[PDB]
Every structure is written in C-alpha cells, then in structure tokens.
C-alpha cells in the first residue's frame, strides 16, 4: 500500500489524514518544532522553489514552505483555509462563489474578488506563472470579517514574461468561473479583472503599457 510506505516514512510519530490523490495529507504534527499542516508526496522541487520566491514578493499571499525532503519528494506546507459556515464547504473561491451565488451584490464578494485579481496582477507583474489557475486553487483565509486570497499548488507553475502565458492563466480562471454556468459569472471575472488592472494601473506608465499588452493578448486568447 502506498499509504504503508508513506506511514513507514514519517513513522508512527506523525498522524496523517489522507485528503486527495493522483497524494496529500493533513497532520497536526510539525516536522521539527517541539495546529494543522499539509504534506505533499510525489515536480515538487519546482513548487518549493517558487513558494520561496513568491513569499518574498511584498503583498503576494501563498502557503508557507515549512519543510522539504527533495530526496523522497515530501513538502510540508502551511494549512490555509477553513470551512464555510452552514456546510457550504471548504473556503476556496469556487465554494465561496457558489455560496454567495444568489446574493452577489455585496462588498464581501466584489472586494474579495478584486483582491483575487490583485494576487494575479502581483504574480504576473513579477513575471511568474501559476499554470493551473482554477477556482479550486485559490483558498481564502479569514481576516476578521474580510477574506484574504492566497494561491496554491504551484506544481505546474513557472517563471515567464511571455505575455501569452499571462493570457492563458487568466483564461483558465475566467473559464473555470464560467464552468459553473452562473448568471453572475460574468461579473466575477470583471471584478477579478478590476483588481488585476488596479495593480498594474499602480505601477505607473510602465504598468499601463505592460498592462495594455497583457489586456490585448488576453482578449485575443479569449477570442481563440
């Protein structure tokens, strides 16, 4: 059993709790220090590196890299996200969106959504790429009564200044939101876009131009 090998690896000392496959766990045990954590087993080396670089970008929210065994393919990441009240599920964007779907005309959803775009704007301004920007790969952390967006599984992620790559990532996202087929899907994407633009429209005349380029490419990609 693969679980057998994993278990033998971290010993009985570490409680695990399988969570996903094709392989991820939870554990309340910290790998070296005397609440809940994440273990990825498996490519990973990529994800680790990235997470390190991404952390260092001011403003950009991503999981803490806690430990990394590159020789066996283990990474312990911090645990982000909680459970929406009323059984609406784990607090990634999809679930948040389904939850508020019949009542989307609030600050909470729009400002939570602009924030999401702020993260992507950030990511792209620094010539980085997710390359799997699904609505399931954006988990929300509670900050008082606001929500704070973070990005996750940078397994298929890379560093790129190719404007096409930025358009694809946006497209993957806007596509995933359209996947649900909500009436309000169009707005979400507009709002995520606002927050994206907001970010570039900040970095000045440079920003506006580079922004204009990614904007046109994205439109093109949406067109293809």
């Amino acid at each position: 059993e693969f679980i057998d090998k994993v278990s033998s690896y971290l010993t009985p000392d570490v409680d695990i709790a399988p969570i996903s496959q094709g392989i991820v766990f939870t554990t309340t045990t910290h790998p070296y220090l005397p609440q809940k954590y994440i273990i990825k087993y498996r490519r990973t080396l990529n994800e680790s590196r990235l997470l390190a670089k991404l952390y260092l970008i001011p403003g950009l929210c991503v999981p803490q890299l806690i430990a990394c065994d590159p020789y066996n393919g283990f990474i312990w990441l911090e645990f982000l996200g909680e459970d929406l009240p009323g059984g609406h599920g784990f607090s990634n964007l999809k679930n948040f969106l389904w939850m508020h779907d019949q009542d989307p005309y609030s600050d909470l959803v729009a400002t939570t959504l602009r924030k999401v775009g702020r993260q992507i704007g950030l990511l792209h301004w620094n010539d980085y790429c997710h390359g799997d920007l699904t609505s399931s790969n954006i988990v929300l952390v509670r900050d008082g009564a606001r929500w704070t967006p973070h990005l996750i599984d940078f397994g298929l992620g890379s560093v790129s200044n190719l404007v096409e790559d930025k358009g694809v990532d946006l497209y993957v996202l806007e596509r995933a939101i359209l996947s649900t087929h909500s009436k309000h899907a169009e707005k979400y994407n507009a709002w995520i876009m606002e927050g994206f633009e907001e970010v570039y429209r900040e970095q000045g005349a440079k920003g506006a131009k580079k922004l204009k380029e990614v904007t046109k490419r994205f439109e093109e990609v949406r067109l293809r």
Partner: protein
Amino acid sequence: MVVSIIPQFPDIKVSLALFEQVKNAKEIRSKMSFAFIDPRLVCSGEQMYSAIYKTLIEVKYNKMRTRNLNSECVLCLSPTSNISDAFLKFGIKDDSSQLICLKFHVDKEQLRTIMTSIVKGQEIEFNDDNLSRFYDEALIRKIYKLSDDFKPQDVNGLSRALVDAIQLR
C-alpha cells in the same frame, strides 16, 4: 537548556543551550563534541530546528559532508554548500559574547556541567524571547542574501525567509 527530538527521527535527541556574557570565545574556538553556533545569525527556534531537520534528512537520505552531525547542522543552518564558509559565518567568532551550544547524541545533569566547563559565560533559556535579543538582522540579510524590498512585519516574517533558504538545500 532544551533536549528535543525531531518527529520523523525519535532515535535522535538533540541538546541546545543559550549563553550570555561569554568571556572565553577564543579560548574555546582555538582549543576545540559540540557545535558552537553564533546566535547573531539565528533569530528563532523555527530557524534552528528546521536546520536540524534538514541535517538529519541529509544524513539519512542523501549524503553526509562533514565529520559529524554537529558540523553538518552548522552546514545545514547556512544557505551555502561550502562547508568552511558555513563554519566561519555560523560558528562562534573570537568576539562572540553569546553562543548556542548544540549536540546530537540521556544525562541532562552531566551535559549542563560539561558545557559550563567549556563556556565561561551565563546560561539562559533556549527560547525565542532570548534568541531575539542577539540575532543581527543586517548581518542575516548579508549572509542569507535578502532583498531590501523584503520587509517583514516581525521576526516570524524574517524566520520564514530563512527556513525557505535552509530547506531548499
């Protein structure tokens, strides 16, 4: 003084102690089984302990470079593959007023007095409050090559950045 184990490695206990007012650094350094780590470059337990982990993982699953695990942790604590440099920047200096005393190996009593035999200085609790009096941020930023644009809200912010560096060995 703390004895601790790493979850994945219960067979290995490790002892850390922190010292103030050390008057015989050079005496020690010159006449050197412990590792004497310069606490100007350690700021948290999260840092120290992650580097221990990495040490073990390295000896268990990859390769051991240095003579023992004490050395190897000094090596693993650093963000470099060059040994002599890690020893030099993370080991005690001749101007070392504080140090972290470390070793790998059950006798708490004999240790506490093997150490104080070596270190003409004043022992104090190995904990974060104490560690964050003696780390030198600018020095850390030098050694761990950190952008001045990187501006963490607190020590956790700093720590994280070093764990990252220690872990991507």
